[PDB]
Nucleic acid binder design. Structure first.
Ligand code: NA
Ligand code: NA
Length: 327
DNA sequence: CATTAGA
DNA sequence: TCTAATG
C-alpha cells in the first residue's frame, strides 16, 4: 500500500503503456499481475532478485525493479513520458468515444490535437462528435448540489409519464459523495421483469420525456434497455448556464432492481466485502440476484427481493445506510 | 461483462 | 459479423 508503492506505480505505468500506445496485450497483462503480486508482498522489495522470487516476476520486470531501485527513475519510463506520439494517444483517448484503437488511428493520420480533431470533425462519429463537443464539461466534476437538482427533475418526469416507475440514482451520489462524475439512473417497472418479454417503450417513454422538457440534449446511445446521453440544468435567469453532463438511464426487470441497485451503489469494496460474506452465510450475490449455495460445490435458485433490506436479512447483516456503504 | 454503433 | 467503446 506504500512500502511497495513506486514499484507498483511504475509497473502500472509500464502496463498502461503497452496496452495503449502499443498493442502488447500480453506485456501489458504481464506488468499487471506483477504489479499486483508485488503489491501484496509484505516487505520492502530490496532488489529485483528478491522481487523475482515472485510469481509473474520475471527476468524482464526484475531488471526493471533494480533500475528503479538503484536510480530514482527508469529510462523506458522517461523516454515514453517524453514521446510525443505516445503522449498523443494518451490525450486523444480523453475524448469520449475515443479509445486506443482510434487513438492510434488518428495519430497515424496526424490528428494529434484538440484542434486537429476539430478540423476533421468529419473523421469522427456522432459519439466522438459529441465527446469533442463537450470536452471541457465532460471532464468537469458534478457538485452534489447539482446532483440534487438533476435528481429532482428526473424523478419528476419519471413520475409524470407513469406513476408506476421506480428510479434510483445510484453511484457515489447515492453514497453521500460531495461530487460525482456523471449521473447514474437505474430504472424499473413492475410491468417488466425477468420473463415478461420487454417493453422497450418503457425505456423510450422517459427518454422522450426528459427530452421534451430539455433535460436531455443529446444521444450518445439509445438501446432498448440502456440509454446513454448528455444533459443540462436549465440555465437560470441568465449570466450562468450549466455545463453539459453525461447521463445514463437503464431499464431493469422489477424482479432484479435491489441487487442491481445495491450493487451499482457500491462502493467497490463494500460490495466485494458484502459479497464475500454472503459466501459464508451460504449465498451468492451478483449484479442481478442472490442465490443459496448448495454444498455439491455450487447451487442456484434466486431468492426473492423487494428491498435492499431483503438482501441484508438474507445474509443476516446489519442494514447499512448507503451513506456508510463506503467499505 | 454486457450493451450499442458501425461498417 | 466482428470490433470497438462505455460502464
Ligand atoms: Na518467479
Ligand atoms: Na476516451
Amino acid at each position: 500500500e506504500t512500502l511497495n508503492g513506486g514499484i507498483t506505480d511504475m509497473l502500472t505505468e509500464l502496463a498502461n503503456f503497452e496496452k495503449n500506445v502499443s498493442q502488447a496485450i500480453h506485456k501489458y497483462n504481464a506488468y499487471r499481475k506483477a504489479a499486483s503480486v508485488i503489491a501484496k508482498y509484505p516487505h520492502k522489495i530490496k532488489s529485483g532478485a528478491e522481487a523475482k522470487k515472485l510469481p509473474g516476476v520475471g527476468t524482464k520486470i526484475a531488471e526493471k525493479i533494480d533500475e528503479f531501485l538503484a536510480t530514482g527513475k527508469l529510462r523506458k519510463l522517461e523516454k515514453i513520458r517524453q514521446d510525443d506520439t505516445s503522449s498523443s494517444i494518451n490525450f486523444l483517448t480523453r475524448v469520449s468515444g475515443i479509445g486506443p484503437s482510434a487513438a492510434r488511428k488518428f495519430v497515424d493520420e496526424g490528428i494529434k490535437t484538440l484542434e486537429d480533431l476539430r478540423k476533421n470533425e468529419d473523421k469522427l462519429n456522432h459519439h466522438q462528435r459529441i465527446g469533442l463537443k463537450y470536452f471541457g464539461d465532460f471532464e468537469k466534476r458534478i457538485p452534489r448540489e447539482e446532483m440534487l437538482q438533476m435528481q429532482d427533475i428526473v424523478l419528476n418526469e419519471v413520475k409524470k409519464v407513469d406513476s408506476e416507475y421506480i428510479a434510483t440514482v445510484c453511484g457515489s451520489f447515492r453514497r453521500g459523495a460531495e461530487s460525482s462524475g456523471d449521473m447514474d439512473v437505474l430504472l424499473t417497472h413492475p410491468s417488466f421483469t425477468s420473463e415478461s418479454t420487454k417493453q422497450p417503450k418503457l425505456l423510450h417513454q422517459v427518454v422522450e420525456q426528459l427530452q421534451k422538457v430539455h433535460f436531455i440534449t443529446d444521444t450518445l446511445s439509445k438501446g432498448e434497455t440502456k440509454f446513454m446521453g448528455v444533459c443540462q440544468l436549465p440555465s437560470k435567469n441568465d449570466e450562468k448556464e450549466y455545463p453539459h453532463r453525461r447521463i445514463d438511464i437503464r431499464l431493469i426487470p422489477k424482479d432484479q432492481y435491489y441487487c442491481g441497485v445495491l450493487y451499482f451503489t457500491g462502493s467497490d469494496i463494500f460490495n466485494k466485502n458484502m459479497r464475500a460474506h454472503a459466501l459464508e452465510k451460504g449465498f451468492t450475490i451478483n449484479e442481478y440476484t442472490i442465490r443459496p449455495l448448495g454444498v455439491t460445490g455450487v447451487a442456484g435458485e434466486p431468492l426473492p427481493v423487494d428491498s435492499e433490506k431483503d438482501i441484508f436479512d438474507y445474509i443476516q447483516w446489519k442494514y447499512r445506510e448507503p451513506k456508510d456503504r463506503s467499505e
